[PDB]
Amino acid sequence: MIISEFDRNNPVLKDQLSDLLRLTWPEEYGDSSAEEVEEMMNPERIAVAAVDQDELVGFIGAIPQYGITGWELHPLVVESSRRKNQIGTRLVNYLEKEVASRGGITIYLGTDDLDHGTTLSQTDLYEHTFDKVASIQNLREHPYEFYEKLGYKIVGVLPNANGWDKPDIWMAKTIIPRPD
């Protein structure tokens, strides 16, 4: 299958994206699902799709949050039935090329830990904040490790973001060579 820029004018494709988002995150994409999809189609954003034949199996987007330099990776979803076969890796790498081409320097993201997937949850993060970040361990195949393998680093945490001891984990990667 191929990874390419998402055709913002393809009703069918946009429908599959909506479903994929609703299925994956039913609590986050219930009503305004097709609506948030349109939000992801914004010209200022980047929208990359993974299509097998004619089926959308993965999608990744990026939002410019700091001028043209800092972008937020959001969202990233791969059909639960097509995971573990480099689709996510290929989507992230394609996104990075697209961001760089627009003058982007860094991409960051927030990956939450709501069900004790890592050692950063179920603990007071204001205590030994960064020692805990540095010694993080993946307890339940939390996706933060997916990003680490792609070169992203945990650069921060948001204590009790989603409720007591259910933090958001901030990760980032600078995608181009540093002026030398």
Ligand X SMILES: CC(C)(COP(=O)(O)OP(=O)(O)OC[C@H]1O[C@@H](n2cnc3c(N)ncnc32)[C@H](O)[C@@H]1OP(=O)(O)O)[C@@H](O)C(=O)NCCC(=O)NCCS
* Binding interface with ligand X (CB under 6 A): 24, 76-78, 83-89, 109, 111, 138, 141-143, 145-146, 149
| AA identity, residue 66 | Y
Cα(84)–Cα(42) distance, rounded to whole angstroms?
Answer: 29
Cα(147)–Cα(93) distance, rounded to whole angstroms?
Answer: 11
Q: Which residues pair with 145 in a beta bridge?
A: none
**Binding a copy of itself by CB under 8 A: which of 9, 81, 141, 179?**
179
CB of 120 to ligand X, least distance (A): 14
- 110 assigned ligand-binding residue: yes
Q: Which stretch binds a copy of itself (CB under 8 A): 34-42, 44-52, 93-101, 165-173?
A: 165-173
Cα(147)–Cα(7) distance, rounded to whole angstroms?
Answer: 26
Residue from 49, 37, 32 nearest 91 by CA:
49
For a copy of itself, the binding residues (CB under 8 A) are 66-67, 69-70, 105-106, 108, 112, 124-126, 129-130, 133-134, 153, 155-164, 168, 170, 172, 174, 178-179
